[PDB]
Amino acid sequence: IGDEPLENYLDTEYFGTIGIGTPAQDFTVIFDTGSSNLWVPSVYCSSLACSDHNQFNPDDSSTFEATSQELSITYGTGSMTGILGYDTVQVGGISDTNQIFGLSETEPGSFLYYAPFDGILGLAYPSISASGATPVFDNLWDQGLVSQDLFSVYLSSNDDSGSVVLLGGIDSSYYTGSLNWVPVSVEGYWQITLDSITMDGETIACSGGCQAIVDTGTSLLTGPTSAIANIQSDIGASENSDGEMVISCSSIDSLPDIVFTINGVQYPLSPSAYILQDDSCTSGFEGMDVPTSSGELWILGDVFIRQYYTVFDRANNKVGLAPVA
Ligand SMILES: CC(C)c1nc(CN(C)C(=O)N[C@H](C(=O)N[C@@H](Cc2ccccc2)C[C@H](O)[C@H](Cc2ccccc2)NC(=O)OCc2cncs2)C(C)C)cs1
């Protein structure tokens, strides 16, 4: 069982350190259940985001083996291109040998320049991995470095320490009640069916069901822009001068919980979860249109995951949820 501590950066990004190569070169990576590639910046990249983050240097690793396979990824925010290569990755106390990973060669755009983390470690299914690169957790399972084909995620609140990815384990110290298991609707993302979104008894979105993914790499609770717009009004949010959804800090005490029904079980989010507070109070919701085969995706990001300990089970292709302790 491997324990990977995560730093909680402003309740918006959760990243942990990994080592790559021999000797180990260290990187912070987002542990991202919404993607499936591992990549870090490399010395081959001249982009500005590469210049203000750690860069992997193959020349200094005795176990590195190059490939001539290239890689390209577009995320909802930014993007990268690079090279695949093989090396030993240290993650959660586990020596993940012969792990294929991306060495960036371009990292355009503002966001990655200002992000505190170097790269991304995806935890989703191999079917959505760019250039078919074996995801890290698949490589762990295939080498037998975890005994149970599952991992769990605890994300702390209020910028506290203690966030953790548990590789190969479930820890009931981190939740209360029993774990509720949700079948994966479509194996790619950790994609599940959301039955309803309600408020004060009344359905306010996702009437008749909608597809959703559980995504540690997304800060907010996002959905189709239209549906999100109604929710933004139902809680009393509106764009400011400079483009942010302001909610009175007065309403954290007044409004009722918003309830997500998943596989017939109710998962409430209180105003203290879906209203981001700092004097300054913003909406935890944000519009973002994610079109796919199965339909337009909702994103249950860190706003939701902070309230529910989450188990990602590849043995039986299910997601487990329980209220955090
Ligand atoms: C400044 C402060 C307030 C904030 N920082 C943030 C951090 N941001 C921007 C995000 O969380 N933004 C999310 C995001 O892209 N998360 C990303 C991590 C990331 C962050 C920054 C730069 C590069 C990558 C990672 C997320 O798991 C997204 C979720 C997703 C899935 C499918 C389609 C679209 C989106 N995953 C992907 O984009 O997967 C890439 C793929 C494309 N094809 C197959 S997988 C968006 C979905 C909104 C939010 S608020």
- Rounded to a whole number of angstroms, the distance between the first and last alpha carbons of the chain is 21
Q: What is the DSSP letter of 324?
A: B
Catalytic residues, which ones? 32, 215
Q: What domain range includes position 122? A: 2-167
Q: How far is the CA of 202 from the centre of ligand 1 (A)?
A: 30
β-strand partners of 150: 313
3-state helix, strand, coil in the chain (%, to 5): 15, 45, 40
How far does residue 111's CA lie from ligand 1's centre (Å)? 10
Residues with CB under 6 Å of ligand 1 are 12-13, 30, 32, 34-35, 73-78, 111-112, 115, 120, 128, 215, 217-219, 288, 290, 299
Helix (H, G, I), strand (E, B) or coil at 225: helix
Q: Whose CA is nearest to atom 40 of ligand 1?
A: 75
Residue 285, classed as helix, strand or coil, is strand
| Rounded Cα distance, 96 and 90, in Å | 6
Phi, psi dihedrals of residue 235, rounded to the nearest 5°:
-100, -10
Which residue has the least CA distance to atom 3 on ligand 1? 12
How far, in Å, are 100, 129, 210 from residue 117 at the CA level? Answer: 20, 20, 32
Asked if residue 85 lies in contact with residue 101, where contact means CB atoms within 8 angstroms, the answer is yes
Q: How far apart are CA 62 and CA 143, in angstroms?
A: 21
* Beta strands 180-183; 119-122: pairing state: unpaired
CA of 290 relative to ligand 1 center, distance in Å: 11
CATH number, domain containing residue 59: 2.40.70.10
Q: Are residues 195 and 206 in contact, defined by beta-carbon separation less than 8 angstroms?
A: yes
Which among 44, 37, 8, 28 has a CA at the least distance from the CA of 119? 28
Method for structure elucidation: X-ray
**What resolution in angstroms, rounded to 1 decimal?**
2.0
